[PDB]
Swiss-Prot record, chain A:
Chief localization: cytoplasm
Keyword field: Cytoplasm, Nucleus, Proteasome
Self-association and partners: The 26S proteasome consists of a 20S proteasome core and two 19S regulatory subunits. The 20S proteasome core is composed of 28 subunits that are arranged in four stacked rings, resulting in a barrel-shaped structure. The two end rings are each formed by seven alpha subunits, and the two central rings are each formed by seven beta subunits. The catalytic chamber with the active sites is on the inside of the barrel. Interacts with CIC1.
Name of a matching Pfam family: Proteasome
Protein name, UniProt field: Proteasome subunit beta type-7
Cell compartments where the protein resides: Cytoplasm; Nucleus
Gene Ontology cellular component annotations, sorted alphabetically: cytosol; nucleus; proteasome complex; proteasome core complex, beta-subunit complex; proteasome storage granule
Taxonomic superkingdom: Eukaryota
Swiss-Prot record, chain B:
Compartments (UniProt record): Cytoplasm; Nucleus
Residue stretches in coiled coil: none
Name of encoding gene: PRE10
Role, per record: The proteasome degrades poly-ubiquitinated proteins in the cytoplasm and in the nucleus. It is essential for the regulated turnover of proteins and for the removal of misfolded proteins. The proteasome is a multicatalytic proteinase complex that is characterized by its ability to cleave peptides with Arg, Phe, Tyr, Leu, and Glu adjacent to the leaving group at neutral or slightly basic pH. It has an ATP-dependent proteolytic activity.
Lineage: Eukaryota, Fungi, Dikarya, Ascomycota, Saccharomycotina
Name listed for the protein in its UniProt record: Probable proteasome subunit alpha type-7
Assembly behavior: The 26S proteasome consists of a 20S proteasome core and two 19S regulatory subunits. The 20S proteasome core is composed of 28 subunits that are arranged in four stacked rings, resulting in a barrel-shaped structure. The two end rings are each formed by seven alpha subunits, and the two central rings are each formed by seven beta subunits. The catalytic chamber with the active sites is on the inside of the barrel.
Record PTM: The alpha and beta forms are probably products of the same gene with different post-translational modifications.
Amino acid sequence: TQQPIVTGTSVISMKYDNGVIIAADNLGSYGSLLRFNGVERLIPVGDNTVVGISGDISDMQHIERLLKDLVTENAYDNPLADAEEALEPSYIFEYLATVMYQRRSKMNPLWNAIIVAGVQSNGDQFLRYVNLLGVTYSSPTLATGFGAHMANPLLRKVVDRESDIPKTTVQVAEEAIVNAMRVLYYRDARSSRNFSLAIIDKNTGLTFKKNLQVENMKWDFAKDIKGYGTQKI
Amino acid sequence: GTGYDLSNSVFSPDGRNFQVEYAVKAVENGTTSIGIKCNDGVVFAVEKLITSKLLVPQKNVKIQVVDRHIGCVYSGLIPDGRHLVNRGREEAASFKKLYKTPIPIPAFADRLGQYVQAHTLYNSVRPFGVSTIFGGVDKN
């Protein structure tokens, strides 16, 4: 049994016609103090998988090392490590899902909420969630912590069910992700303006975008709001 | 008298370990393998005896990778060579876990050296029937 110290907020994700998009901000919060601003919370494993981790940062860095060792271990005595026997998004998730549930059963959990986003070898989109309790689920849209309350409602307006996936393009999906990141910056007190965005497509491959910022913010209407009820000036 | 060659850790009258020298005979019997150090790297090569046409070409890989920068090739008892690489991979992972940086080649060399030397200290263990050529690129 432990307690989270340095923490990362929401990890938001959705799947479109050709692949998946995942995003998380670059903040490392220390309670109410916004301590670290150069924290990458999206971890690319190979060229077909990106792992988005929220929660305890020290536990995240441990998972980082586990994923880098999984790449190293898979290449051992494997002449097809870059071809047929490469690490699939499903292999990466199931390993982490096993670890997360084993740790909670030993009463010493990794204080994290993880989304594994990628594309399988056959072209299928992979998007599954796993947390500190070992709870696993798949949905057209997935979000951790604060994003589950705010980003999910917005992203489900684009993809409400399975049939909406082939109807959604990269341009529409990314726009919905970027919009959700802006909304999270509005109402989440543990959020950063700077964020990373990763696109895993079955055609164009992995596209990792760094140092993105929340733009086109509405703040002008604040000048007209004065007092808290009866004050006029 | 005689019998100094029947047990592993036993010194012979001339200060030799015959069981180790007999392990060398298993290496000399094995396939030939080489290593060439160049100006910025190393190159490993091995002979692969085609016993019959039934052997699937390019499949029975002999050269093994340790970590992501070290390559190992050996001659003699192949199973013994695999055991040494298995230990070397654990040894490399133990270094990276504590020191962050990937294991240096001279550092990795001693790690295999101490482990093989350990199998010459006891009569309950057998010496390795392999000579291993290995290397890679590190900090310097």
